[PDB]
Amino acid sequence: RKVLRDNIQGITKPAIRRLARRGGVKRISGLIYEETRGVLKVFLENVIRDAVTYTEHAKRKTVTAMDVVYALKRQGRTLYGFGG
Amino acid sequence: NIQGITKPAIRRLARRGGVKRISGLIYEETRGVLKVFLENVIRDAVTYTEHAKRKTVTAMDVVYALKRQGRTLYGFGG
Amino acid sequence: PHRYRPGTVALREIRRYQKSTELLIRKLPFQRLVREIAQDFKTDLRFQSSAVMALQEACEAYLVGLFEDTNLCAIHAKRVTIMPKDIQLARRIRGER
Amino acid sequence: YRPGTVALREIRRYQKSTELLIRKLPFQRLVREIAQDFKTDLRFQSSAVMALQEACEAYLVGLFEDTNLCAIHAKRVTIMPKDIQLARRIRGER
Amino acid sequence: AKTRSSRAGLQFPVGRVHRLLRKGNYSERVGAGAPVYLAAVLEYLTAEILELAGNAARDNKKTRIIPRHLQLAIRNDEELNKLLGRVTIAQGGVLPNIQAVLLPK
Amino acid sequence: KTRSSRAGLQFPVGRVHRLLRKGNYSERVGAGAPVYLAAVLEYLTAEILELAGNAARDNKKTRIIPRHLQLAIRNDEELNKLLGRVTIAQGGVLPNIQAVLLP
Amino acid sequence: SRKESYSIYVYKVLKQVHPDTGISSKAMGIMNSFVNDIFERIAGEASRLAHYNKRSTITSREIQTAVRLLLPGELAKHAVSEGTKAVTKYTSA
Amino acid sequence: RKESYSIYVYKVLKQVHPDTGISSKAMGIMNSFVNDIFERIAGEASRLAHYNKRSTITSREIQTAVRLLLPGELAKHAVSEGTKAVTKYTSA
DNA sequence: ATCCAAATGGATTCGAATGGAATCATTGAATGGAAATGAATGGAATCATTGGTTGGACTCAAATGGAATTTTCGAACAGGCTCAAATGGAATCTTCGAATGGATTCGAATGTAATCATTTTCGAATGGATTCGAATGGAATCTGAT
DNA sequence: ATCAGATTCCATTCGAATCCATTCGAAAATGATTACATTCGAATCCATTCGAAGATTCCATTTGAGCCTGTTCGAAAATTCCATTTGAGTCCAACCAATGATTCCATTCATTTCCATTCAATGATTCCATTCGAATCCATTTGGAT
């Protein structure tokens, strides 16, 4: 498969802008869209790391939504609706 | 007794947090927040004390309470 | 031609998305991004669609929450606009730094 | 001595110290009152009131550093209740 | 041939909650009344959440509860919100709140 | 003759084994888990005690009292992250003073 | 592939409260997440409870003081009630 | 009766720093540290054994537990010190 | 207050994915007769704390005095909102091979379990200490005016 | 800036006092040790599930023009808050005298644990039923310009 480089830029200016709306934000500065993609990255790393560690104590090479779940739980952000 | 915690004690606690200047309405808000804290902790503390059917709070119970609140304490045995 | 004045399609949009629950990041760009983070973590990994859906969900949750707290940091300093300085204050008091 | 730098010197005074910054047990006065509004004929271990005071002032120094950052963020050098409420709201305590 | 869910007047299976207490290694032995009292707290909590949800379900004109309704149910009930402070609902949404200072002059 | 020596550790391995069975963690406890764990505990204490000793004296005091422990933990990023949610008795704060407030 | 869920009982308790209204399988999911989360928070809290006092069994008293410890305010009251009666009605055969 | 780690933290201390000792308050803090950490690790191991539904905690569980709790290279160094302790134990 | 313009509701209808039944079969609650514990049970030393009353001593509570932080303005600057035409690529569909799970068989290798006997570890005093609270002298420092 | 006088830290020695040190007996703990149990680490053959790729529609993405207003600007006004002495007010800590409240036994009964051995409960199936995800519309805005 093709190389995976630079997908954090698929999170566009508008998608970040909506996510500002539903959080109740009026005017969005220019320096925000980089700073958003920054924090989102850190976030998804810490969760995806922790998901995959579960996957491979599980000795599976498919990440289960349960492992996404446990991961999130471990982080202090409990998620409902994917518990199966 | 909430004012037995005086203005000087409060301002010192403001110092160790590294603050320059203190507002007049602060000490009030302080006594408020300390009160809510000491309340949520002591409540959980006491629940630990008398599930034990003991009516004296052990420092272990304060520790457990603090653990349950998410503010962990080291040095009293927990 | 008419121009709605600065800020009032913004309010229209806050009420727009707050009254909806749809996922706000476009699903495929996200899905790649997850495969990149996951792969440059570990290789030859496969996902359940429920597992990226789970992710994106938790993610927009996380982000929209942070955006509310950021906006309060904006308001507190008497600004109408969120800056990075705000996000760094929000995540500092949230204890993420 | 000029305004504001006996404040700095005092910052260094107490940060360079670990002393309990609230007096004795006017604190435990307050502790026993709060406690008996929960249950009566209660007794404390001296270690347990010390424990409380400890975690409590710890808590307060935390809230004061965060509030102080809120003060700075608003261009101000002085902490106001508005600050304490912003801090306590972001922490999720409200 | 008596089921325990009847004997305490509950819908939530008490026998199950007993098995799950043992299969979870919470302590080596389980009293007879602990699974009961707990199946009670869970059935009660379910009940409370479900008919708070129904309220906003029919205030948005719908015969059926979708996660949104649940989310609005929890977020508007102070004690439940507090209980679920760290929980995030699948497909939940937010409360239509707008900070005051952002309204026109 | 203790398993701690046979694994080369100072931290009691037998104790950790018992404390694993009676802590209700699962009905069965592997043979290597208590060892590996007693190791992580000896190591982590060790790391702490050493960073604590270093920071114990640049100020020339005999031994590690709580403050020394505090400065040890709060100065080492990985420890501070691990223990961010812990509060040390008699700890203190790092002498930080925000710049905007300096002369 | 067959094992467990609470969906039956959330469905009945649903008909008890709001007999008109139905439930969509996603929102049903979120309820499963809720029962599971809560079962776990309570049983853990109870288990550390038995442990701090050095006793090998979990009783109703334990589940109770667990419920008093987790739940905020008035649903903590309402819960202790609902349980205390579930139990006293139980020991009655 | 009853237990404390003060013995082994004292040994480990002078093994590491034969220069320095410890004041009983800081000793307490250390006991608390060991207890907290033991607890976090063992619990994470226990849910780990549960999420994949197996009745034993092995070295392997303690391991992905430690990878899960400890940040970065303190996790790597830790996996080490323990992974060696175990084979040198098992070699008899 | 005025007519005007895109946008916002929320009430009509349309084929379709979603929910909620009835039905057959696999687990799992549940009976019920011994096996093993568990918690009070009344009965006792022991510890660990309420309780006053005691002095030197900071530590507090007020109240002068002014000095700079905060507020409020009013002005200059620029950044972000808004709109519109191209078009990029997501979203949808439906295909399809087979890597990767998974139910279920299966046994050597691993962890329990009484049951002992040996030693480690605790607690409690007993003998050098190690740093607390002064003692000041000296940069070091802060800040008032030739 | 390098005077210029005070507080003030910032340390080099002292005579002590609150611990920690190693010692020094008396449980509770670990480690073996044969003797059972069990868990799974080890082979399969099924079966979900996912990765992929091509194609066609049009929903959004982007990008740049244009300018309103929100940020930061420097300044000017008003006020809350630091520094500083003085009153006295309540602490530090000091033992110290008392019997409540722990908590540890050496008994028993009630309670939970087992373990087959069935009894319903529950969960997986289609199985064909309805809210509803789209679809326009104009009532009702609501907007910003007259």
Numbering used by the authors:
A (entry chain F): 19 to 102
B (entry chain B): 25 to 102
C (entry chain E): 38 to 134
D (entry chain A): 41 to 134
E (entry chain C): 14 to 118
F (entry chain G): 15 to 117
G (entry chain D): 32 to 124
H (entry chain H): 33 to 124
Sentences from the paper on this structure:
In the nucleosome, about 150 base pairs of DNA are left-handedly wrapped around the histone octamer, composed of two each of the core histones H2A, H2B, H3 and H4. In this study, we reconstituted nucleosomes with methylated and unmethylated human satellite 2 DNA fragments, in which the CpG sites are reportedly hypomethylated in cellular carcinomas. Our biochemical and structural analyses revealed that the DNA methylation influenced the positioning and the DNA end flexibility of the nucleosomes assembled on the satellite 2 sequence, without affecting the nucleosome structures and stabilities.
We crystallized the nucleosomes containing the methylated Sat2L (145 base pairs) and Sat2R (146 base pairs) DNA fragments and determined their structures at 2.63 Å and 3.15 Å resolutions, respectively. In addition, the DNA binding path in the methylated Sat2R nucleosome was not different from that in the unmethylated R nucleosome. The histone octamer structures in the nucleosomes containing the methylated Sat2R and Sat2L DNAs were the same as that in the nucleosome containing the unmethylated Sat2R DNA. Therefore, we mapped the 5-methyl-cytosine locations on these nucleosome structures in two nested orientations. Six out of the seven CpG sites were incorporated into each SatR or SatL nucleosome. Interestingly, in the Sat2R nucleosome, most of the 5-methyl-cytosines tended to be exposed to the solvent. In contrast, the MNase susceptibility of the Sat2R nucleosome was enhanced upon DNA methylation.
